[PDB]
Amino acid sequence: MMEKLKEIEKVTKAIKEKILNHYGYIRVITHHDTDGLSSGGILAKMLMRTNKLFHLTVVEHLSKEVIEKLAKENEVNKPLFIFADMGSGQIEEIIKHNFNAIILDHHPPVIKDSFINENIIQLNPHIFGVDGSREITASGVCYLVAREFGYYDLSVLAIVGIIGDMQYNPLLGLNKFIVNEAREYRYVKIMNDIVYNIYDVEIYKAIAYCTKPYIPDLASEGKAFKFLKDIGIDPNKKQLDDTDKKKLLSAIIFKYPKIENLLIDRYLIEHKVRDAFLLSEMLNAVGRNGLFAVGIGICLEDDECIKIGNQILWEYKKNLINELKSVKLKKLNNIYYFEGKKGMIGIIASILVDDKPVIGYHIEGDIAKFSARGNRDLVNRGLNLSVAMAVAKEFGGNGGGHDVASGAVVSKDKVQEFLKRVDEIIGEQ
Numbered sequence: 200m201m202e203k204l205k206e207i208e209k210v211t212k213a214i215k216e217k218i219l220n221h222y223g224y225i226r227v228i229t230h231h232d233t234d235g236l237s238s239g240g241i242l243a244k245m246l247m248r249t250n251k252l253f254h255l256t257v258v259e260h261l262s263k264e265v266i267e268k269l270a271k272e273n274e275v276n277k278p279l280f281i282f283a284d285m286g287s288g289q290i291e292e293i294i295k296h297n298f299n300a301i302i303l304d305h306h307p308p309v310i311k312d313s314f315i316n317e318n319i320i321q322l323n324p325h326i327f328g329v330d331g332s333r334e335i336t337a338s339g340v341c342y343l344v345a346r347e348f349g350y351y352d353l354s355v356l357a358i359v360g361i362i363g364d365m366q367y368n369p370l371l372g373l374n375k376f377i378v379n380e381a382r383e384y385r386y387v388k389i390m391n392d393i394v395y396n397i398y399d400v401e402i403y404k405a406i407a408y409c410t411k412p413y414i415p416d417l418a419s420e421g422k423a424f425k426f427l428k429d430i431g432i433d434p435n436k437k438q439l440d441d442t443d444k445k446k447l448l449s450a451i452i453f454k455y456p457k458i459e460n461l462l463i464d465r466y467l468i469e470h471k472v473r474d475a476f477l478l479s480e481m482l483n484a485v486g487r488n489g490l491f492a493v494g495i496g497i498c499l500e501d502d503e504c505i506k507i508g509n510q511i512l513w514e515y516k517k518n519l520i521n522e523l524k525s526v527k528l529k530k531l532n533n534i535y536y537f538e539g540k541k542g543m544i545g546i547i548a549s550i551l552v553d554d555k556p557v558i559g560y561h562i563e564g565d566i567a568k569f570s571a572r573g574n575r576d577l578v579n580r581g582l583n584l585s586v587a588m589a590v591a592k593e594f595g596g597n598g599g600g601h602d603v604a605s606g607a608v609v610s611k612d613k614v615q616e617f618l619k620r621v622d623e624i625i626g627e628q
């Protein structure tokens with residue numbers, strides 16, 4: 200059990216008092232990812248209810264350049280700064296420039312102290328042994344502050360961040376605590392359901408652009424429409440009922456045998472976007488596109504911001520199916536590999552995993568960047584991609600971490616030799 204929360208609650212009561220007693224400008228810096236926008240929304244709602252006007256800025260990276268610019272505004276009547284999914288790692292520069300500052304972070308800390316001089320407070324649950332890799336997100340840290348004011352309804356946005364940062368399989372620690380609070384206070388219903396019911400669009404559209412999972416023989420409106428018609432589902436239906444689910448699963452198992460991946464615990468939230476999965480996806484797509492303020496408007500439930508969000512999400516999903524259909528996969532005994540576009544190799548690699556591991560790579564300058572990916576059924580059968588990718592050391596290179604995700608870097612001239620060798624090291628099956 201978590202007496203770690205009692206230790207958390209000491210810092211939250213202080214953050215509350217620091218906000219309640221601050222009568223000047225308040226300045227909120229947050230990130231463009233789902234965890235950042237969610238954090239933005241929770242913070243926005245918390246501060247409006249506490250009668251604080253504030254200026255919200257969304258930032259890609261919190262670099263030295265950006266701290267300096269933020270700092271040039273700290274001479275002119277110094278605002279309280281609230282850093283969201285960031286600040287713990289750049290704290291030395293924040294202390295230097297003498298910001299009146301609150302850091303709400305879950306990235307690994309540089310200073311394992313909550314109270315850093317008068318007028319800096321860092322809430323980073325690593326300091327209490329939580330783990331921002333698996334048990335808490337920024338949305339969640341921001342929610343832990345919101346609770347001190349009695350704003351349990353902001354838990355809905357906390358859950359969006361949990362899904363954003365991929366900390367919902369499995370749901371551990373504080374994240375588990377937050378979801379249970381949201382359920383206790385009636386702001387989320389959790390129910391097992393087929394993945395296609397997340398999108399509240401026509402089922403054939405839900406199936407065609409779905410990448411969780413990506414079933415390639417169904418990845419176009421035509422094929423998905425044919426497939427649904429041939430087994431008696433109204434393809435323009437927006438929710439599959441229990442009878443439809445059976446007909447769908449019964450038939451799809453021939454094209455996609457791992458039925459269990461089509462069934463998901465759905466978070467149904469008290470938010471105009473009724474599905475936390477859908478909201479997470481929407482927020483990520485407006486963030487990818489630099490529509491940060493629209494992002495904040497989706498969190499605040501603006502009808503037009505949501506219409507924009509829906510349009511951008513479905514554009515994003517079409518482009519992603521187009522990029523997947525264009526990958527030239529190459530078989531190699533134990534492994535598929537592909538050459539791909541800078542920034543895309545990892546996300547593509549994880550979507551293309553069925554039976555065997557998948558290594559994507561980009562050739563930039565003198566160097567080849569690999570991203571190797573697998574699944575739980577692959578680690579259970581003996582797979583660790585960390586040891587596989589480490590074989591880069593044999594080619595003058597370096598090789599990455601984790602049993603499913605891992606990367607590597609090798610000279611462009613040694614690609615075919617490296618992949619050959621990573622393939623052999625998957626004798627561990």
Ligand SMILES: [Mn+2]
Pocket residue numbers: 232234235284336337364
């Ligand atoms: Mn994050």
Ligand SMILES: [Mn+2]
Pocket residue numbers: 230232234235284
């Ligand atoms: Mn982030």
